[PDB]
Design an enzyme around this catalytic site. Structure first.
Site, PDB file in Angstrom:
ATOM      1  N   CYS A 278      54.693  24.192 -24.134  1.00 31.02           N
ATOM      2  CA  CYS A 278      54.689  23.110 -23.156  1.00 31.02           C
ATOM      3  C   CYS A 278      54.280  21.939 -24.028  1.00 31.02           C
ATOM      4  CB  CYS A 278      53.704  23.354 -21.996  1.00 31.02           C
ATOM      5  SG  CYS A 278      52.026  23.956 -22.355  1.00 31.02           S
ATOM      6  N   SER A 279      53.122  21.345 -23.786  1.00 25.52           N
ATOM      7  CA  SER A 279      52.714  20.263 -24.659  1.00 25.52           C
ATOM      8  C   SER A 279      51.564  20.768 -25.498  1.00 25.52           C
ATOM      9  CB  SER A 279      52.281  19.025 -23.890  1.00 25.52           C
ATOM     10  OG  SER A 279      51.994  18.001 -24.826  1.00 25.52           O
ATOM     11  N   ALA A 280      50.572  21.368 -24.845  1.00 22.53           N
ATOM     12  CA  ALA A 280      49.409  21.899 -25.549  1.00 22.53           C
ATOM     13  C   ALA A 280      49.640  23.351 -25.944  1.00 22.53           C
ATOM     14  CB  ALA A 280      48.170  21.789 -24.671  1.00 22.53           C
ATOM     15  N   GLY A 281      50.560  24.005 -25.250  1.00 24.28           N
ATOM     16  CA  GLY A 281      50.839  25.390 -25.563  1.00 24.28           C
ATOM     17  C   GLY A 281      49.865  26.268 -24.822  1.00 24.28           C
ATOM     18  N   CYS A 282      49.326  25.696 -23.757  1.00 21.73           N
ATOM     19  CA  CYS A 282      48.382  26.382 -22.906  1.00 21.73           C
ATOM     20  C   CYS A 282      48.499  25.695 -21.553  1.00 21.73           C
ATOM     21  CB  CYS A 282      46.976  26.259 -23.473  1.00 21.73           C
ATOM     22  SG  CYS A 282      46.187  24.677 -23.200  1.00 21.73           S
ATOM     23  N   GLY A 283      48.355  26.488 -20.495  1.00 22.04           N
ATOM     24  CA  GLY A 283      48.473  25.989 -19.135  1.00 22.04           C
ATOM     25  C   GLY A 283      49.722  26.603 -18.519  1.00 22.04           C
ATOM     26  N   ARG A 284      50.833  25.899 -18.671  1.00 25.59           N
ATOM     27  CA  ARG A 284      52.115  26.336 -18.166  1.00 25.59           C
ATOM     28  C   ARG A 284      52.590  27.455 -19.040  1.00 25.59           C
ATOM     29  NH1 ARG A 284      54.808  20.383 -17.945  1.00 25.59           N
ATOM     30  NH2 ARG A 284      53.290  19.906 -19.630  1.00 25.59           N
TER      31      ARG A 284
ATOM     32  N   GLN B  77      45.061  27.107 -18.145  1.00 19.72           N
ATOM     33  CA  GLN B  77      44.043  26.078 -18.083  1.00 19.72           C
ATOM     34  C   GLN B  77      43.426  25.629 -16.762  1.00 19.72           C
ATOM     35  OE1 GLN B  77      45.123  22.618 -20.613  1.00 19.72           O
ATOM     36  NE2 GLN B  77      43.140  23.074 -21.557  1.00 19.72           N
TER      37      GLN B  77
HETATM   38  O1  LIG Z   1      42.149  16.443 -27.420  1.00 23.06           O
HETATM   39  C1  LIG Z   1      41.487  15.756 -26.668  1.00 23.06           C
HETATM   40  C2  LIG Z   1      42.083  15.030 -25.466  1.00 23.06           C
HETATM   41  O2  LIG Z   1      41.837  15.735 -24.258  1.00 23.06           O
HETATM   42  C3  LIG Z   1      42.876  16.397 -23.613  1.00 23.06           C
HETATM   43  C4  LIG Z   1      43.823  15.804 -22.776  1.00 23.06           C
HETATM   44  C5  LIG Z   1      44.823  16.534 -22.167  1.00 23.06           C
HETATM   45  C6  LIG Z   1      44.950  17.905 -22.348  1.00 23.06           C
HETATM   46  C7  LIG Z   1      45.927  18.673 -21.755  1.00 23.06           C
HETATM   47  O3  LIG Z   1      47.051  18.794 -22.287  1.00 23.06           O
HETATM   48  C8  LIG Z   1      47.782  19.520 -21.595  1.00 23.06           C
HETATM   49  C9  LIG Z   1      49.090  19.905 -21.824  1.00 23.06           C
HETATM   50  C10 LIG Z   1      49.757  20.734 -20.928  1.00 23.06           C
HETATM   51  O4  LIG Z   1      51.054  21.060 -21.240  1.00 23.06           O
HETATM   52  C11 LIG Z   1      49.080  21.185 -19.783  1.00 23.06           C
HETATM   53  C12 LIG Z   1      49.680  22.010 -18.860  1.00 23.06           C
HETATM   54  O5  LIG Z   1      50.058  23.286 -19.121  1.00 23.06           O
HETATM   55  O6  LIG Z   1      49.928  21.663 -17.735  1.00 23.06           O
HETATM   56  C13 LIG Z   1      47.763  20.790 -19.563  1.00 23.06           C
HETATM   57  C14 LIG Z   1      47.127  19.962 -20.478  1.00 23.06           C
HETATM   58  C15 LIG Z   1      45.889  19.393 -20.575  1.00 23.06           C
HETATM   59  C16 LIG Z   1      44.924  19.569 -19.663  1.00 23.06           C
HETATM   60  C17 LIG Z   1      44.043  19.661 -18.815  1.00 23.06           C
HETATM   61  C18 LIG Z   1      43.105  19.692 -17.881  1.00 23.06           C
HETATM   62  C19 LIG Z   1      42.952  18.597 -17.039  1.00 23.06           C
HETATM   63  C20 LIG Z   1      41.988  18.602 -16.057  1.00 23.06           C
HETATM   64  C21 LIG Z   1      41.165  19.692 -15.899  1.00 23.06           C
HETATM   65  C22 LIG Z   1      41.305  20.786 -16.730  1.00 23.06           C
HETATM   66 CL1  LIG Z   1      40.259  22.145 -16.518  1.00 23.06          CL
HETATM   67  C23 LIG Z   1      42.278  20.794 -17.728  1.00 23.06           C
HETATM   68  C24 LIG Z   1      44.005  18.494 -23.184  1.00 23.06           C
HETATM   69  C25 LIG Z   1      43.008  17.767 -23.792  1.00 23.06           C
HETATM   70  N1  LIG Z   1      40.123  15.560 -26.808  1.00 23.06           N
HETATM   71  C26 LIG Z   1      39.327  16.165 -27.867  1.00 23.06           C
HETATM   72  C27 LIG Z   1      38.151  15.236 -28.084  1.00 23.06           C
HETATM   73  C28 LIG Z   1      37.969  16.710 -27.724  1.00 23.06           C
END
Ligand SMILES: O=C(COc1ccc(-c2oc3cc(O)c(C(=O)O)cc3c2C#Cc2cccc(Cl)c2)cc1)NC1CC1
Length: 302
Positions: free
Chosen positions: A226-232, A273
């Site tokens: 997906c984008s992060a490779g986790c969640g979907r 996620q």
């Molecule tokens: O790298 C970062 C920036 O922070 C982030 C921003 C967004 C995401 C993020 O990417 C995603 C990509 C996806 O593709 C899906 C997806 O599969 O849908 C979900 C997420 C998701 C997510 C999420 C999410 C949102 C709200 C609540 C919860 Cl529990 C999780 C992950 C991290 N910070 C570092 C300093 C530490």
């Protein structure tokens, strides 16, 4: 017990006790709690991913592959040229049934095809758009009709055909490397089931079905991103796993959506996620059990 019995029990149990949003919340909180203990305990190091040479290859700094299950690159191996943000996920019969990874960066597009080639992957499942909420969630690694070949290092990718379905596209790709040409099937899921629409889970089941039409077995891994490779990526993965069990009559008596997600989250960080994605898995799984019980019923009718 036998499959019919175990399936009937799971079916009845769910019927006689609908789960609530709060129970879902309570369930998912436990999963996150386990991750915390595992962190504090240092059970699944991410030493490789944190290396300086690899930081710039991670789309999300918080999402790193556990050292133990990360996918290693060895094709046309620079010293850190072996790292990619991807984790092998175990199928029902053995390991490396799936590879969960991130939507590639312009910087790791070459790494992506190396991996897909080094492991003879036949299927790629993309569960995101290039742009989401106005942000770039994935670089172009595929090719579209009329574009001819695209070049990623020694890799030449082009698109022979495209099958356009309701909520996804199936691109038949031809990948060439060293005078060798392989066919890769990209499943681009440009939609997602809606929390407020019980029927909206039908498109995701159709997706996995088609996928399984192109590969029923686990001979090579199936790449899902997906984008992060986790969640979907985790949802599709969890459902395929649970479905594979149903199809082959091996649903352990002690089966729970809960254990499933827990098992997955110990193979890739936050593979599923959110609580919403957790509920979708529960709902999708349930539907699969019903469809399987039907199959059991029509075969009992001999
Ligand atoms: O790298 C970062 C920036 O922070 C982030 C921003 C967004 C995401 C993020 O990417 C995603 C990509 C996806 O593709 C899906 C997806 O599969 O849908 C979900 C997420 C998701 C997510 C999420 C999410 C949102 C709200 C609540 C919860 Cl529990 C999780 C992950 C991290 N910070 C570092 C300093 C530490």
């Amino acid at each position: 017990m036998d499959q019919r019995e175990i399936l009937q029990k799971f079916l009845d149990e769910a019927q006689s006790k609908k789960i609530t949003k709060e129970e879902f919340a309570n369930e998912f909180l436990k999963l996150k709690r386990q991750s915390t203990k595992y962190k504090a305990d240092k059970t699944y190091p991410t030493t490789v991913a944190e290396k300086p040479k690899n930081i710039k290859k991670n789309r999300y700094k918080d999402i790193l592959p556990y050292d133990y299950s990360r996918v290693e690159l060895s094709l046309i191996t620079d010293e850190d040229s072996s790292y990619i943000n991807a984790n092998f996920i175990k199928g029902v019969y053995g390991p490396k049934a799936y590879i969960a990874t991130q939507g590639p960066l312009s910087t790791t597009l070459l790494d992506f095809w190396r991996m897909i080639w080094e492991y003879s992957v036949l299927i790629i499942v993309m569960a995101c758009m290039e742009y989401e909420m106005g942000k770039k969630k994935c670089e172009r690694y595929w090719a579209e009709p009329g574009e001819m070949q695209l070049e990623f290092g020694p890799f030449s990718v082009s698109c022979e055909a495209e099958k356009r379905k309701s909520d996804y596209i199936i691109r038949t790709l031809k990948v060439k490397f060293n005078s060798e040409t392989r066919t890769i099937y990209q499943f681009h899921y440009k939609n997602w089931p809606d929390h407020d629409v019980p029927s909206s889970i039908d498109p995701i089941l159709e997706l996995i079905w088609d996928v399984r039409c192109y590969q029923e077995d686990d001979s090579v891994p199936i790449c899902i991103h997906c984008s992060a490779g986790c969640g979907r990526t985790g949802v599709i993965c969890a459902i395929d796993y649970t479905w594979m069990l149903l199809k082959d009559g091996i649903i352990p008596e002690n089966f729970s959506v809960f254990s499933l997600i827990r098992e997955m989250r110990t193979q890739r960080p936050s593979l599923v996620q959110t609580q919403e994605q957790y509920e979708l898995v529960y709902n999708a799984v349930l539907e699969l059990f019903k469809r399987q019980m039907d199959v059991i019923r029509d075969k009992h009718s001999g």
